[model samples]
Target: GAMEMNMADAPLEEGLLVCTRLDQNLCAELISFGSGKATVCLTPKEFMLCEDDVVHAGFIVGAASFAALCALNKKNSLISSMKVNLLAPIEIKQEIYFNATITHTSSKKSTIRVEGEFMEIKVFEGDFEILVFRPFK
Candidate 1:
């Protein structure tokens, strides 16, 4: 069986976490988050995509990057690199679900696996390498 796909209602309001590192409105909304795992739901707007509702690659991948950060759940986490794959095109109004899990981790780095799906079919995948570091002004 697939992982439990349950999330609380209206998570956007309780979104101090949502505003931290990602733009929830342009990307997606936080569904649920747990230790080393998180989920997000995406509903693309018409203007965000081209004709026929084909969603842009950046939006989906941008959401994936945000998903990776939540898995690490570190305040200073920075996504240094990502290996992303767009398996299928996501259309507007077809809400997509994304999941992220910490597949590997060390003291200062985390490798998170991010994936998106439309129902049972996988449409996107990415492996993000995040580093915990202090930023200077």
Candidate 2:
């Protein structure tokens, strides 16, 4: 099961904030957003992942981590610490799917886990340990 999403009773929000700066071009392209999870499309731009399509590891994690932050669906969060592993190489044109989930979102300190897939292949996953700050003013 390559990164499956269980929408069973999932309180999916209608994008609480649309005019936010988190719609990052250098990070992820948000496809869907909810309270504790998000789905992002990972189609790298020209020379961003690489012209040769080897896939840039930097942006790979960026997209992965960005999904974690977006999953919280809060204002002004910080990724204090995180650990990740890229299981395999990704192609630039592949429509990769990155999924993120929150464990303890009721507290300031929580860990949001993320999983990425390319064509039903588990290519990426990470533990996004984050700290919450004041909401955007």
Candidate 3:
């Protein structure tokens, strides 16, 4: 399937990856956002983990940071690129927290710093750059 490619009109929280159909139990919810920071959280479900029941690293990269980016950039600009690092393995069904902050911003692009944690243990981190552009018609 092709990408949705129409998130600009969606609410910030709606940007989080919602596990659909078979994985409907898995979902991320908005916690809060203020100033330059934002947060989203989720509890892993059985379908979200691997055979050993570990949370997949891809979830943090795709869902957590994407939510952060959408929250940080209220203007809903286009994401140009992102870099994610898996800091530690997250356990299945563990509550994961994601936090994001704008590191810098300019007319053309904005940079954001994102981090994910399970309790006090850091699970993932990422840096993303989004481009300023008019919404497609």
Candidate 4:
């Protein structure tokens, strides 16, 4: 009684954009793309039935990360940790856009500011101080 919302089939991209977990929910959608931002939309049917059944915490984080990755110029950059601030809750059936910008950069680590928007309005925002953690294995 479930379906797949693979980002590959919709976004016209080459890889899986949405997380494997969300993709299995049949509610995740790669909505739109901009010069330095991306939008992810979800629905109530995909959430766990409880006090909150529209949008989940995991979606906010994933959307932010995806936006940061898309904005990053270095395609090889890796994300270390997510420093997120939950200012507000993202509701379902609404287009939430994740935006990021490079605040600082170095050889090992870099800092980027990420923000989430709903209906062209700022909902949640945070700063991510990430390190390029790569193992030569």
**Model 2 regions lying over 4 Å from their true place:** 1-19, 134-137
lDDT top scorer: 1
Candidate 3 per-residue lDDT, tens place, 33-133, comes to 66777777877766667657567766656656555565554553666788888877766668878888888988778898888888767878888887765
Which one is best on TM-score?
1
Model 3 has an lDDT value of 0.67
What is candidate 4's lDDT per residue for 82-101, written digit by digit as tens? 67776776555566666677
lDDT of 2 by residue, 19-89 (tens): 26554666667778776788887887766655475788888888887788778866756788989998887
Tell me the spans in candidate 1 whose CA falls farther than 4 Å from its real position: 1-21, 134-137
Q: Per-residue lDDT for 16-135 in model 1, tens only? A: 343374567888888877788988888898767855857888888988887788777776668889999999887888878889999999989989999899886899999999988655
- In angstroms, give how far residue 62 of model 1 lies from its true place: 0.8
Question: Candidate 4, which segments miss by more than 4 Å at Cα?
Answer: 1-54, 133-137
Worst 10 residues of 2 by lDDT: 10-19
Residue 47's lDDT within candidate 3 is: 66
Q: In order, what lDDT does every prediction score?
A: 0.80, 0.75, 0.67, 0.57
* Residue 40, candidate 4: C-alpha displacement in angstroms: 6.0
